[PDB]
Design an enzyme around this catalytic site. Structure first.
Site, PDB file in Angstrom:
ATOM      1  N   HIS A   3      -6.130   0.822  -1.927  1.00  0.00           N
ATOM      2  CA  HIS A   3      -5.533   2.129  -2.317  1.00  0.00           C
ATOM      3  C   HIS A   3      -4.082   2.312  -1.832  1.00  0.00           C
ATOM      4  O   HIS A   3      -3.432   3.322  -2.222  1.00  0.00           O
ATOM      5  CB  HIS A   3      -6.428   3.266  -1.886  1.00  0.00           C
ATOM      6  CG  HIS A   3      -6.525   3.527  -0.421  1.00  0.00           C
ATOM      7  ND1 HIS A   3      -7.654   3.217   0.292  1.00  0.00           N
ATOM      8  CD2 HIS A   3      -5.721   4.240   0.411  1.00  0.00           C
ATOM      9  CE1 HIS A   3      -7.520   3.663   1.530  1.00  0.00           C
ATOM     10  NE2 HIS A   3      -6.336   4.278   1.626  1.00  0.00           N
ATOM     11  N   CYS A  27      -6.053   4.804   7.858  1.00  0.00           N
ATOM     12  CA  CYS A  27      -6.382   3.711   6.898  1.00  0.00           C
ATOM     13  C   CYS A  27      -5.542   2.485   7.242  1.00  0.00           C
ATOM     14  O   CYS A  27      -4.310   2.592   7.561  1.00  0.00           O
ATOM     15  CB  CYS A  27      -6.278   4.139   5.438  1.00  0.00           C
ATOM     16  SG  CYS A  27      -7.599   5.308   4.994  1.00  0.00           S
ATOM     17  N   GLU A  54     -12.096  -3.186  -1.700  1.00  0.00           N
ATOM     18  CA  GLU A  54     -11.062  -2.303  -1.083  1.00  0.00           C
ATOM     19  C   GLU A  54     -10.154  -3.084  -0.133  1.00  0.00           C
ATOM     20  O   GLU A  54      -9.360  -2.441   0.598  1.00  0.00           O
ATOM     21  CB  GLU A  54     -11.746  -1.108  -0.403  1.00  0.00           C
ATOM     22  CG  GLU A  54     -10.779   0.042  -0.129  1.00  0.00           C
ATOM     23  CD  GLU A  54     -10.009   0.591  -1.323  1.00  0.00           C
ATOM     24  OE1 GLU A  54     -10.485   0.390  -2.471  1.00  0.00           O
ATOM     25  OE2 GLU A  54      -8.897   1.167  -1.108  1.00  0.00           O
ATOM     26  N   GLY A  58      -4.245   8.953   7.837  1.00  0.00           N
ATOM     27  CA  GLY A  58      -3.330   8.227   8.731  1.00  0.00           C
ATOM     28  C   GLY A  58      -3.990   7.037   9.423  1.00  0.00           C
ATOM     29  O   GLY A  58      -3.221   6.233   9.967  1.00  0.00           O
TER      30      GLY A  58
END
Length: 182
Positions: A41, A148, A72, A146
């Site tokens: 992402h 990730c 991911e 914040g």
């Protein structure tokens, strides 16, 4: 404070950079040579900022499993003048549960942050922001925007990177040794 934090600090001080994309600032784990990982992402493009230096992206691959399900994880090769310490021998070979994990973050917003998240479950399937995702680890800590890209470790192993939360639980994508064979 103890050997968990000791292993986490050793990984953060040598194997992380601050990555900035158009979608924000992320903790980015360097794995070997000029190869690093970041949550998919982050939407990596042709250019990324690494510690506020304009850097060409030589290759970027959003990983999916052999069910063609999102993992991911994006693997990035950076046009950087320096290699990372090779930490592939700290990566697990198989999916597993863990005790006594640490989530470590380093950004402008959260420098030198270490969170003892405790027990980690092999959760498996998660609908992550609407996207079916496999190989998810779960821990019972209220993680926040914040974190990730944050690195999940146990003593002796680098097991995942933080990719989301639901306000009570946090979720990481597994790192497996097989992702980084060359």
């Amino acid at each position: 404070m103890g050997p968990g934090f000791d292993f986490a600090q050793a990984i953060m001080k040598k194997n992380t950079v601050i990555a900035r994309t158009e979608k924000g600032e992320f903790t980015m784990l360097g794995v070997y040579d000029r190869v690093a990982v970041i949550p998919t992402h982050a939407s990596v493009g042709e250019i990324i900022y690494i510690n506020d230096v304009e850097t060409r992206v030589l290759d970027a691959c959003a990983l999916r499993d052999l069910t063609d399900t999102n993992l991911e994880i994006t693997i990035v090769k950076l046009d950087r003048n320096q290699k990372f310490r090779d930490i592939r021998h700290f990566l697990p070979r198989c999916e597993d549960d863990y005790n006594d994990a640490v989530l470590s973050v380093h950004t402008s917003k959260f420098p030198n942050m270490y969170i003892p998240v405790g027990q980690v479950t092999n959760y498996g399937f998660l609908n992550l922001g609407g996207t079916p995702t496999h190989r998810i680890l779960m821990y019972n800590f209220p993680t926040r925007a914040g974190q990730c890209g944050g690195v999940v470790t146990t003593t002796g192993k680098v097991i995942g990177i933080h990719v989301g939360g639901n306000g009570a639980q946090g979720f990481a994508a597994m790192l497996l040794h097989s992702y980084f064979t060359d």
